[PDB]
């Protein structure tokens, strides 16, 4: 899997491939790896599909119950709940999650939670098997306070390379835009991104 979240001027954008593999066989070629835990807090799932789904489901439950009592939770609060599950059950979980959310005070924020259960707040995060091939590219090309069109291109070009080199990654490039304006879903097909 190839997943990334990038902070920009107006908020944050989540990007992912659509390929789920068992061995060398593609079980699902149109997977949605970008999942909603709250209205403007989303996550990118990588690793066990059973685990990443089970974790995401519990967090959505916790943040729904949080909202009932204490109103809208921060992106940091969501990442803390993810960390708590991942860290305390590190022996029984294979899950690399990127948490991304839009507050009105804090704007766009990105937290990455690797296998360990550690939390890392970053301007942008890349994860999954495909990520290895685009560390060089992403580091050289990422700038802070990019525009929406710049950030969409940055994610599209990055995941395009990840997909090209990683057998485990492929299909469509899904993206989810988190800004004050609201939530926008974007899709990009092979015929576009392959020939970038």
């Amino acid at each position: 899997t190839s997943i990334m979240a990038v902070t920009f001027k107006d908020g944050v954008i989540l990007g992912a491939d659509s390929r789920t593999t068992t061995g060398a066989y593609i079980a699902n070629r149109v997977t949605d790896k970008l999942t909603r835990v709250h209205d403007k807090i989303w996550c990118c799932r990588s690793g066990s599909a059973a685990d990443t789904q089970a974790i995401a489901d519990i967090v959505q439950y916790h943040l729904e119950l949080y909202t009932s009592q204490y109103g809208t939770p921060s992106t940091e609060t969501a990442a803390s709940v993810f960390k708590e599950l991942c860290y305390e059950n590190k022996d029984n979980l294979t899950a690399g999650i990127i948490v991304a959310g839009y507050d009105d005070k804090n704007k766009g924020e990105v937290y990455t939670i690797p296998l360990g259960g550690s939390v890392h707040k970053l301007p942008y995060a890349i994860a999954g098997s495909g990520s290895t091939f685009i560390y060089g590219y992403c580091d050289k090309n990422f700038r802070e306070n990019m525009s929406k069109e710049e950030t969409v291109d940055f994610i599209k070009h990055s995941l395009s390379q990840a997909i090209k080199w990683d057998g485990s990654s492929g299909g469509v490039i899904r993206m989810v835009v988190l800004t004050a304006a609201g939530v926008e879903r974007l899709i990009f097909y092979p015929d576009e991104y392959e020939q970038l």
Binding site: T1, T20, T21, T22, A27, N28, T31, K33, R45, S46, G47, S48, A49, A50, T52, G128, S168
Partner: peptide
């Protein structure tokens, strides 16, 4: 088993 499925991976991502």
């Amino acid at each position: 088993f499925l991976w991502x």
